[PDB]
Structure 1
Amino acid sequence: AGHMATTKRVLYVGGLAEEVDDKVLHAAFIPFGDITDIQIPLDYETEKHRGFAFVEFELAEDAAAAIDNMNESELFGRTIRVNLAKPMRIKEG
């Protein structure tokens, strides 16, 4: 039919600690399905983390299960938030 939203197999993440790395999100997101890419962009002004990230699955049903089994979770002693990404020109086609 079509994509679940303005994006496909992508998940926004927030509430992360400044110590969280792409290996932490990979270890947290892998049991729900095959991960295909991960992003943790720094502030682009001071080279520091902002407590948010993105994760991307090989399948869309794995991203839906990840929303259903990782939202409101807790990483590094802080509560996280997880959902599909907001509308914007994505790096993908």
Structure 2
Amino acid sequence: GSSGSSGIFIGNLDPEIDEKLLYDTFSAFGVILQTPKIMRDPDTGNSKGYAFINFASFDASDAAIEAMNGQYLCNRPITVSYAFKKDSKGSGPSSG
């Protein structure tokens, strides 16, 4: 089902790609929680340009955002970026 909410946002996806492909294309890095989803236009309903995929844990999402972030896809450079992130606490010891 799902353990956490460590989802990832993908953009600039070729209109020739399908949920089946992506699943695997990404599966390589880490394990997917459930079938991926692609945002389509409310008009044609073929392919908008961006999709949404969630991994098992952050460890998996990290790999992608590291490599997948830019990976030249089917004549279309994809971009992986954490769907949502909450600013953590930690300024750091500084003197200035």
Q: Which has the higher contact order (CA 8 A, sep 6+)?
A: 1
Identity %: 33
- Provide the secondary structure at the position in 1 that maps to 2:44: coil
**Cα pair 2:13 2:50 within 8 Å, conserved:** yes
The structure number with the bigger radius of gyration is 2
- Aligned equivalent of 2:65: 67
Q: Pick from 11, 15, 20: which aligns with 2:8?
A: 11
Give 1:15 shift: 1.0
- Provide the secondary structure at the position in 1 that maps to 2:33: strand
5 Å matches for 1:15-30? 15-30=12-27
- Aligned equivalent of 2:55: 57
Distance between the aligned counterparts of 2:81 and 2:68, measured in 1? 10
- Aligned equivalent of 1:34: 31
Distance between the aligned counterparts of 1:68 and 1:27, measured in 2? 18
* Contiguous gaps of at least 5 residues in structure 1: 1-6, 88-93
Q: Structure 1 segments of 4 or more deviating over 6 A? A: none
Deviations 1:46-77 (A, max 9, x none): 31211110111111211111211211011111
Q: TM-score, normalised by structure 1?
A: 0.75
Q: TM-score, normalised by structure 2?
A: 0.73
- Provide the secondary structure at the position in 1 that maps to 2:14: coil
Work out the number of aligned pairs and report it.
81
| Structure in which a larger fraction of residues adopt helix | 1
- Provide the secondary structure at the position in 2 that maps to 1:83: strand
